């Protein structure tokens, strides 16, 4: 079969065919912005490729059809990214998160396999025949790592060396080929990185590299040439084609650069979700980002409980583990601008408000089944926070524009509104359905308050009046008894029980700016808008103040989400039929279904439904 | 676009007679 060679330019990508005359054409591609890396199927004719001006990674078949965007979140410079052929595996390097990661060829189960002491990794290259992956690392000490392509048992191969490209991998040689970008040579070693050898050193700017049959295939940006030559010696050179400027990579076409076998090439390991070769020609199973691999070693269980996170345009999970896994960026189309989330336990559907658009939003985990909850025709509204009562089914939320409390069923069906007056100014808003009670912060004019009231809006109190500037986000914690909020202007995190009693400072030093806070087990989560951290204090006392994650940009909201018993959820009194309640369930004293209705209804004779 | 060659030219740009060690280098051109 024919061999050719595929290199990446500006916004194309052409195929050279090498066997017959030196004959140009483009591959037939639309939409890509900037091609950087290149890699292939040999099994499906399909090309893969980075694009750094769009920050994704998309395939196609070789005429062009068939464009799929394959990772298209939580990219920022995807230089490196090779295509594991036995296991059907995407793997990638992002020198700009510091990441190499991995997902199935069309882009699903996606995990991240080294991140830790990992900084700026560039060039890619997979051996899955053996079970190990390379890769060469720029910021800091520049070195050429190795690990296998499960991540595990990384290693230092080369460690003396400038930055390097071209990584590449002479299968039927056992020898491994690079460019070295700041000693402008290029260099091959074996495979365990040494009896090292200069294979041409009179190079002005070598850039890219690839290897076939007898010879070494190079570009170089000074001589803005693709150039080939022998693979040992460096002589008998030629000049592929010439006046070809910032060629970002190239690399040989053909079946002999992807052969062999391993036990992921048939039925996929038996795996559920991911195939990865291990020394010495074995394999594990892998999971997707945050899963566990079950009992069996084959199959994987969803994360029970979480963090998630949200910044301007994106949502993030985080979880507490052994392998301080990283956090990921849920993969959620139609997310614009998030201001702030919550989470349903029992449907496992993420909530959110949109200040863009000005609406309430609910999607899977994964992006799918996006729905609007809360919607303005093209008067006008402003959804500024929201609480879901798990067990009546409802979200409570307060709304900038008309500073009312209304209250929506998650299918968007409006209930009412429960709080709206002349003054009032209800901003921050939390439920506690266990216990009858919503708890929200009311941003009056020269005076800030933190109320209470029934969940139908009755039984108003204010339970703090003073010491108060900008109350900007509430938490609280049924179990422990405790209310919690963040004031941005007075920097500090204050608590007190659910009765307004206890009223304690946690932290006020060394804060800027808090806009959120959560509960998860015994610790307080909280984040920092100014200074861009996660931070969680022990509630117990015993542990100190701990920093979680640090340089994170325009946080906007965090949430804990617990594994919903589903005995115990069934034994609040409005989970099941909303205790015959057409509008409001709330209990109250004797642990007893009491309905009420919005302000704009008023309970009929029958007292389970609401009238005129 | 050129996020990519930008990010490239940026890191080896130094390496250019016209640095002495006293160059924040010169801006980027060769976008298009
Ligand atoms: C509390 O929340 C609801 C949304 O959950 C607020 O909007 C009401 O939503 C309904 C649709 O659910 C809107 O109905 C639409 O209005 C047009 C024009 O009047 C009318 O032909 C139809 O009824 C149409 O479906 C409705 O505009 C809107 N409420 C009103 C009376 O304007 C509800 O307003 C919220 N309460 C407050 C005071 O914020
Ligand atoms: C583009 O190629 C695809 C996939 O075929 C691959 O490339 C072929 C040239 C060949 O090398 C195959 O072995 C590769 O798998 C075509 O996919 C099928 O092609 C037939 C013929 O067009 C078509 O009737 C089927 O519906 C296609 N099936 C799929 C997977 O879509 C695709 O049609 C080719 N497009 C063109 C312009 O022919
Ligand atoms: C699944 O993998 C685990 C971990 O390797 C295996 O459990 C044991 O792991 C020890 C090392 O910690 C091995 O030396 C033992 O052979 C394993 N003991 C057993 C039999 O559980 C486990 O065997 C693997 N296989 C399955 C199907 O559970
Ligand atoms: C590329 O050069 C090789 C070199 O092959 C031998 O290599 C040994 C060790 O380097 C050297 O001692 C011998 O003198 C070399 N022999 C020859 C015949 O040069 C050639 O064998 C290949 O043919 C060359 N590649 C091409 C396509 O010319
Ligand atoms: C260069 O290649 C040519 C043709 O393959 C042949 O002369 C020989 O293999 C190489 N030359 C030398 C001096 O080895
Ligand atoms: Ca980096
Ligand atoms: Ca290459
Ligand atoms: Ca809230
Ligand atoms: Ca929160």
């Known amino acids: 079969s024919e061999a050719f060679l595929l290199f990446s ?39 893969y490729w980075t694009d750094i001006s769009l920050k994704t990674i998309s395939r196609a078949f070789m005429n062009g059809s068939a464009l799929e965007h394959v990772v298209e979140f939580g990219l920022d410079y995807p230089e490196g990214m090779a295509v594991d052929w036995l296991g059907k595996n995407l793997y990638w390097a ?41 890769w060469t690392e720029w910021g800091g000490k520049p070195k050429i790592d190795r690990a296998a392509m499960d991540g595990s048992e990384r290693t230092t191969l080369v460690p003396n060396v400038g930055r390097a490209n071209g990584l590449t991998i002479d ?5 491994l080929y690079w460019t070295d ?25 070598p850039f890219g590299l690839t290897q076939y ?85 084959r199959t994987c269980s969803a994360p029970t409980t979480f963090l998630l996170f949200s910044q301007k345009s994106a949502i993030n999970r985080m979880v507490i583990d052994e392998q301080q896994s990283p956090d990921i960026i849920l993969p959620i189309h139609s997310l614009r601008n998030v201001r702030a989330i919550d989470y349903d336990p029992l449907d496992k559907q993420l909530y959110w408000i949109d200040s863009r658009q000005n609406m309430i939003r609910k999607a899977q985990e994964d992006g ?86 029934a969940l139908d809006g009755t039984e ?18 049924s179990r422990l008894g405790k209310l919690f909020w963040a004031d941005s202007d007075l920097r500090r995190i204050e608590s007190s029980d659910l009765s307004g009693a206890n009223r304690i400072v946690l932290e006020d030093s060394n804060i800027l700016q808090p806009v959120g806070l959560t509960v998860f087990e015994n610790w307080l989560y909280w984040i920092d808008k100014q200074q861009q951290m996660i931070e969680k204090i022990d509630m117990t006392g015993r542990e100190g103040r701990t920093k979680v994650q640090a340089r994170i940009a325009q946080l906007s909201d965090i949430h804990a989400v617990k594994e919903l018993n589903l005995q115990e959820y069934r034994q609040h009194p409005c989970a099941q039929d909303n205790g015959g309640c057409s509008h409001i369930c709330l209990v109250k004293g004797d642990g007893t279904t009491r309905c009420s209705c919005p302000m704009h209804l008023v309970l009929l004779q029958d007292e389970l439904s609401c009238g005129e | 676009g050129c996020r990519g060659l930008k990010r490239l030219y940026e890191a080896f740009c130094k390496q250019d007679s016209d640095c002495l060690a006293g160059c924040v280098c010169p801006m980027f051109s060769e976008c298009g």
């Not at chain 1, 299968?171 to 020898?175: H, L, Q, T």
């Not at chain 1, 339970?463 to 914690?477: H, R, T, V």
């Open chain 1, 368 to 453: 799918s089944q996006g729905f609007t909850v809360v919607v303005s025709s093209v008067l006008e509204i402003q959804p500024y926070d929201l609480s879901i009562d798990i067990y009546s089914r409802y979200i409570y939320w307060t709304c900038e524009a008309t500073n009312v409390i209304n209250v929506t069923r998650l299918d968007g069906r409006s209930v009412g509104v429960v709080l709206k007056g002349e003054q009032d100014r209800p901003r921050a808003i939390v439920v506690n359905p266990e216990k009858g009670y919503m708890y929200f912060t009311n941003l009056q004019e020269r005076s800030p308050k933190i109320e209470r009231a």
């Open chain 1, 171 to 175: 299968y039927a040689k056992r020898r």
């Open chain 1, 94 to 134: 992002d020198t700009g998160t510091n990441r190499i990661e991995v997902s199935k060829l069309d882009g699903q189960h996606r995990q991240v396999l080294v991140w830790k002491d990992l900084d700026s990794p560039r060039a890619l290259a997979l051996d899955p025949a053996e079970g190990f992956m390379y």
């Open chain 1, 181 to 205: 970008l700041d000693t402008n040579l290029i260099e091959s070693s074996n495979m365990l990185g040494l009896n090292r050898e200069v294979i041409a050193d009179d190079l002005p700017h």
């Open chain 1, 213 to 297: 049959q007898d010879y070494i295939y190079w570009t170089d940006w000074s001589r803005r040439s693709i150039e080939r030559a022998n693979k040992t010696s460096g002589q008998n050179r030629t000049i592929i084609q010439g006046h070809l400027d910032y060629v970002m990579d190239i690399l040989v076409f053909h079946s002999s650069r992807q052969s062999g076998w391993n036990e992921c090439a048939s039925s996929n390991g038996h795996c559920s979700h991911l195939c990865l070769a291990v020394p010495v020609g074995g394999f594990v199973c892998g999971c997707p980002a945050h899963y566990s691999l079950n009992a069996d070693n």
């Open chain 1, 460 to 477: 108003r109190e204010v339970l703090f009046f003073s010491g108060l500037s900008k109350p900007i986000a509430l938490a609280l914690d």
């Open chain 1, 9 to 47: 330019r500006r916004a194309d990508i052409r195929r050279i065919s090498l066997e017959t005359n030196n004959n140009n054409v483009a591959i037939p591609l639309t939409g890509v912005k900037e091609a950087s890396a290149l890699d292939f199927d040999v099994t499906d004719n399909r090309i």
